[PDB]
Amino acid sequence: IGMEPASLKEDVQWHLLARMVPFVENNYNVCELGPRGTGKSHIYKECSPNSILVSGGQTTVANLFYNMSSRRIGLVGLWDVVAFDQVAGISFKDKDGVQIMKDYMASGSFARGREQMEASASMVFVGNINQSVESLVKTSHLLAPFPEAMIDSAFFDRFHAYIPGWEIPKMRPEFFTNRYGLIVDYLAEFFREM
């Protein structure tokens, strides 16, 4: 991925491995919240062609899942990993978007219109930390940076992991390895075939 194993502690290496876990698991929903500059999204935009990053926070339900007009499957049918960056920006025009998301990430398939479609895409929520971890624990829940529209126990309970984005240090050149590494899409196709 370009990180230096010798320059990182073993726990941070485990966290980075947890970052790539979704690439091998079908319908893996994972949420990571971490400080800026910690290289959260680099793995999701540079290190894999089977992963897509959705920025801007505003995206339509049909675009992700299935279009009534064009009768074609959405992003979940096209990429192995779908990653929502800047989770604070997540907003849906339809109110059922949250419900259809919940059904999808619960069952791996969604019934929209008259038809139920399967999808093995794994969903990731990458967000920025604004306040210290101790203060966040004392005053609120760690999932606070999600907008109020999706702050729900049922919505969060489908999540399988909350990655400690604070534990990984902010990206610095000594963290960027310069040794021999596996080919990027070699590793990506490895992930796909596993």
Specify the stretch interacting with a copy of itself by CB under 8 A; choose among 9-17, 52-60, 125-133, 144-152: 52-60
Q: Give me the 16-45 binding string for a copy of itself, x by CB under 8 A, dash otherwise.
A: ----------xx------------------
How far is residue 47's CA from residue 123's CA, in Å, rounded to a whole number?
17
Residue with Cβ nearer a copy of itself (49 or 181): 49
Residue 119 exposed, middle or buried by CB count within 10 Å (0-12, 13-18, 19+): buried
Residue with Cβ nearer a copy of itself (15 or 65): 65
Please report how close the Cβ of residue 5 comes to a copy of itself at its closest, in angstroms. 27
How far is residue 170's CA from residue 177's CA, in Å, rounded to a whole number?
14
Tell which positions 58-97 bind a copy of itself, by CB under 8 A: 58, 63, 75, 78, 95-96
Task: At 10, list the tokens.
Answer: 């073993």
Residues 6+ apart with CB under 8 A from 157: none
> How far are the Cα atoms of 54, 160, 186 from residue 122, in angstroms, in the given order?
13, 11, 20
Task: Examine residue 52 and tell whether it contacts a copy of itself (CB under 8 A).
Answer: yes
Q: Are 129 and 94 in contact (CB under 8 A)?
A: no
One residue of 17, 88, 111, 149 binding a copy of itself per CB under 8 A = 111
Please report how close the Cβ of residue 185 comes to a copy of itself at its closest, in angstroms. 15
One residue of 114, 134, 148, 179 binding a copy of itself per CB under 8 A = 114
Residue with Cβ nearer a copy of itself (100 or 143): 100
Residue with Cβ nearer a copy of itself (8 or 83): 83
Task: Examine residue 138 and tell whether it contacts a copy of itself (CB under 8 A).
Answer: no
How far is residue 127's CA from residue 139's CA, in Å, rounded to a whole number?
19
Residues 6+ apart with CB under 8 A from 139: none
How far is residue 15's CA from residue 163's CA, in Å, rounded to a whole number?
7
Residues forming the site for a copy of itself (CB under 8 A): 26-27, 52-53, 55-56, 58, 63, 75, 78, 95-96, 99-100, 103, 108, 111, 113-114, 118, 120
